[PDB]
Design an enzyme around this catalytic site. Structure first.
Site, mmCIF file in Angstrom:
data_model
loop_
_atom_site.group_PDB
_atom_site.id
_atom_site.type_symbol
_atom_site.label_atom_id
_atom_site.label_comp_id
_atom_site.label_asym_id
_atom_site.label_seq_id
_atom_site.Cartn_x
_atom_site.Cartn_y
_atom_site.Cartn_z
ATOM 1 N N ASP A 127 -14.516 -81.933 -26.310
ATOM 2 C CA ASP A 127 -14.363 -81.545 -24.906
ATOM 3 C C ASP A 127 -12.978 -81.882 -24.378
ATOM 4 O O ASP A 127 -12.816 -82.244 -23.210
ATOM 5 C CB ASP A 127 -15.440 -82.166 -24.021
ATOM 6 C CG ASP A 127 -15.765 -81.319 -22.795
ATOM 7 O OD1 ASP A 127 -16.376 -81.863 -21.857
ATOM 8 O OD2 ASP A 127 -15.411 -80.115 -22.764
ATOM 9 N N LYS A 187 -9.724 -81.392 -22.556
ATOM 10 C CA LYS A 187 -9.198 -80.574 -21.476
ATOM 11 C C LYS A 187 -8.612 -81.530 -20.443
ATOM 12 O O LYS A 187 -8.968 -82.711 -20.429
ATOM 13 C CB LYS A 187 -10.293 -79.698 -20.850
ATOM 14 C CG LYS A 187 -11.469 -80.474 -20.301
ATOM 15 C CD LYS A 187 -12.539 -79.539 -19.713
ATOM 16 C CE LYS A 187 -13.718 -80.310 -19.160
ATOM 17 N NZ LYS A 187 -14.722 -79.386 -18.580
ATOM 18 N N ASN A 219 -10.695 -84.109 -18.320
ATOM 19 C CA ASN A 219 -11.375 -85.240 -18.938
ATOM 20 C C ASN A 219 -10.436 -86.375 -19.284
ATOM 21 O O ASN A 219 -10.862 -87.346 -19.910
ATOM 22 C CB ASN A 219 -12.157 -84.810 -20.178
ATOM 23 C CG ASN A 219 -13.429 -84.090 -19.831
ATOM 24 O OD1 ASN A 219 -13.893 -84.137 -18.688
ATOM 25 N ND2 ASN A 219 -14.029 -83.458 -20.824
ATOM 26 N N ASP A 225 -16.058 -88.389 -20.442
ATOM 27 C CA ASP A 225 -17.018 -87.323 -20.726
ATOM 28 C C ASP A 225 -17.223 -87.127 -22.219
ATOM 29 O O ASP A 225 -16.549 -86.306 -22.859
ATOM 30 C CB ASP A 225 -16.651 -85.988 -20.083
ATOM 31 C CG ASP A 225 -17.833 -85.038 -20.041
ATOM 32 O OD1 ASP A 225 -17.776 -84.034 -19.303
ATOM 33 O OD2 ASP A 225 -18.835 -85.301 -20.747
ATOM 34 N N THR A 283 -14.761 -76.048 -23.361
ATOM 35 C CA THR A 283 -14.342 -75.113 -22.315
ATOM 36 C C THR A 283 -13.578 -73.940 -22.926
ATOM 37 O O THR A 283 -12.830 -74.125 -23.896
ATOM 38 C CB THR A 283 -13.495 -75.806 -21.231
ATOM 39 O OG1 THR A 283 -13.388 -74.953 -20.078
ATOM 40 C CG2 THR A 283 -12.085 -76.161 -21.707
#
Ligand SMILES: CSCC[C@@H](NC(N)=O)C(=O)O
Length: 339
Positions: free
Chosen positions: A155, A157, A160, A173, A190
């Site tokens: 994850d 991005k 985060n 996260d 994402t």
């Protein structure tokens, strides 16, 4: 280097001891006051809370068990908590307590008042290469650590990556993190950050994290991601083509590194070759990086987020404040037995 090998061996030993015997039920809801909703999603939210006895502030992630089940996120939520309670690294937000009740799951994390990298990046436009490189080095080390434990993060991005009081990153996260020896198959992440092998529904491995690092470095240095398009299908078409246009202001070293991280063929992607992470750490773009100094947090950060204290919420967004209810009947007890 034997020093790094021995460091990672100890890191894995300590992770495995907690992984095999996870902590459970280390706080309870009525020991905390709710202060403000910092984020909200389809099955949970993150609250700023204050411990009533110590006065410490925490970010409490609250997941609604019934909604977790309905949206088929059971294993992901169990992954998140089991991994977080077992890891320990300077650039990972620390899980301090966890517990559950009739309705919800709770992970009580450290609170990082500086906010998300995303907001700082969007405010200033783009980061200079030294600034992007400082953050990128922390992600490289964090992925070296996680991957050595057989963990895929999945994850990455800007949202985060929180910026702490010293200007260093804390990754938050772990909702998609998973312990994987070999391949895994879940569609998650994402859109702008998905590796081609995820888009194509293949079995994939830790190389997806190194792809996502390429996306992150590009976005930090350019101000926008490399495969940007208005619609997800167009993003996906650009990703699987791998055609990337670099701004003329990118250094040649940056372009070379990104070509090797944004390699569509996962068997040719930096981070996934015989030399592993060292192809990245030894790349000329990182020539100025003292990896040990970064790990030890001895490098002066490019900037310190502005905030007034550990209770300041000004770097986060405003959300409607909704009730956090606890049913008189236990919900989904079986599914979350191990939490
Ligand atoms: C600290 S977040 C939870 C606080 C909230 N919920 C319950 N049920 O007590 C309340 O007191 O309304």
């Amino acid at each position: 280097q034997e020093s790094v090998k021995e460091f990672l061996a100890k890191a894995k030993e300590e992770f495995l001891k907690k992984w095999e015997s996870p902590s459970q039920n280390t706080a309870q809801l009525d020991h905390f006051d709710r202060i403000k909703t910092l984020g909200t999603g389809s099955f949970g939210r993150v609250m700023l809370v204050k411990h009533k006895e110590t006065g410490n502030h925490y970010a409490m992630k609250i997941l609604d068990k019934q909604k977790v089940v309905k949206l088929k996120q059971i294993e992901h939520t169990l992954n998140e908590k089991r991994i977080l309670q077992a890891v320990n690294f300077p650039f990972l937000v620390k899980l301090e307590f966890s517990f559950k009740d009739n309705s919800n799951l709770y992970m009580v994390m450290e609170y990082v008042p500086g906010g998300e990298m995303f907001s700082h990046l969007r405010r200033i436009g783009r980061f200079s290469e030294p600034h992007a490189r400082f953050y990128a080095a922390q992600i490289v080390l964090t992925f070296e650590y996680l991957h050595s434990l057989d963990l895929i993060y999945r994850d990455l991005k800007p949202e985060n990556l929180l910026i702490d009081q010293q200007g260093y990153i804390q990754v938050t996260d772990f909702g998609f993190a998973k312990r994987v020896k070999g391949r895994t198959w879940t569609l998650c992440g994402t859109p702008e950050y998905l590796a081609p092998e995820i888009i194509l529904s293949k079995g994939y491995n830790k190389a997806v994290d190194w792809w996502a690092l390429g996306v992150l470095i590009y976005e930090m240095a350019a101000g926008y991601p490399p495969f940007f398009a208005d619609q997800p299908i167009q993003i996906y078409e650009k990703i699987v083509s791998g055609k990337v246009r670099f701004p003329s202001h990118f250094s040649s070293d940056l372009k070379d590194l990104l070509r090797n991280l944004l390699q569509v063929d996962l068997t040719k992607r930096f981070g996934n070759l015989k030399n592993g992470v060292n192809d990245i750490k030894n790349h000329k773009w990182f020539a100025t990086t003292d990896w040990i100094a970064i790990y030890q947090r001895k490098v002066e950060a490019p900037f310190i987020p502005k905030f007034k204290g550990p209770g300041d919420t000004s770097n986060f967004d405003d959300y409607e404040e909704e009730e956090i209810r606890v049913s008189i009947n236990e919900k989904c007890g079986k599914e979350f037995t191990e939490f």
